[PDB]
């Protein structure tokens, strides 16, 4: 009511955290940060629920205060730090790098990446504006303000950011035929090639995306994130390649795998 809220009920938490219902009344309320409350993975969820290096939140705090975890190359000690799409989580002590990426079920998968691919990330530019004596500034989906971008870079484009310097390495335009992922809605986590963007002035543009298996879907323009030029992604993809399976196909695959494994 008065002032901001500071708690988050366990059942009111984002469903993609895959939290329980009997492990307490509260869920980790993500801190303010680059990503939204419902589109982020708090560091405690990643280090405890996913990676299982910790059994309690106190162990997550113990891990984080040893400065063992870096998000986008910067050490974070906030166990509720909001880590979201495209963030690089590096643990030099155990020598592993992950990229926070979406699974076809709309959940942040545990996606391991090489030390060479942990040096950069992809950012969707949210706005471009001229300010402060004529300098063009560009704001990204992770609230990274970059001055003097390439004049070709526009809104809805993707820029490769070198994490050490925070500067633009290359960019992919938003165009038909470019690979992209869906970062919101029902099609969250699916990867495909843009086929048609149909504009609605004064309203939300709708972008149509075709899977690598031929399946076609649609999303709002705000939910598109260009992944690569053409059909080659600029970043590594999860075990699934953005191809969402039907429940029947997934059941058949699971049955066949169990038959051939044990």
């Amino acid at each position: 009511a008065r002032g901001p809220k500071k708690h988050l009920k366990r059942v009111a938490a984002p469903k993609h955290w895959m939290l329980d219902k009997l492990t307490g009344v509260f869920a980790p309320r993500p801190s303010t940060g680059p990503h939204k409350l419902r589109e982020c993975l708090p560091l405690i969820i990643f280090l405890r629920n996913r990676l299982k290096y910790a059994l309690t939140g106190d162990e997550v705090k113990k891990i984080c205060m040893q400065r063992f975890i870096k998000i986008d190359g910067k050490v974070r000690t906030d166990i509720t730090y909001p880590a979201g799409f495209m963030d690089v989580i590096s643990i030099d002590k155990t020598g592993e790098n992950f990229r926070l990426i979406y699974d076809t079920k709309g959940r942040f998968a545990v996606h391991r990446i090489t030390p060479e691919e942990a040096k950069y990330k992809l950012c969707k530019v949210r706005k471009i504006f001229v300010g402060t004596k004529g300098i063009p500034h560009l704001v990204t989906h992770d609230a990274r303000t970059i001055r003097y971008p390439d004049p070709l870079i526009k809104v809805n484009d993707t820029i490769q950011i070198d994490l050490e310097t925070g500067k633009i390495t290359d960019f992919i335009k938003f165009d038909t035929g470019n690979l992209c992922m869906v970062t919101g809605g029902a099609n969250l986590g699916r990867i495909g090639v843009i086929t048609n963007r149909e504009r609605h002035p004064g309203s939300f543009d709708v972008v149509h995306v075709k899977d690598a298996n031929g399946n076609s879907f649609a999303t709002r323009l705000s939910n598109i994130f260009v992944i690569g030029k053409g059909n080659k992604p600029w970043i590594s993809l999860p075990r699934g390649k953005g191809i969402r399976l039907t429940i029947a196909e997934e059941r058949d695959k699971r049955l066949a795998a169990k038959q051939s494994s044990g």
Partner: peptide, 30 residues
């Protein structure tokens, strides 16, 4: 850093405007 960034963007803007002018002249060619 401010001076270096301003110089780099000035050169990049000159290159980009030259490319845009070349495209404009090629468009007016048709």
């Amino acid at each position: 850093k401010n001076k270096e960034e301003a110089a780099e963007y000035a050169k990049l803007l000159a290159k980009r405007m030259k490319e845009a002018r070349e495209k404009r002249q090629e468009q007016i060619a048709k």
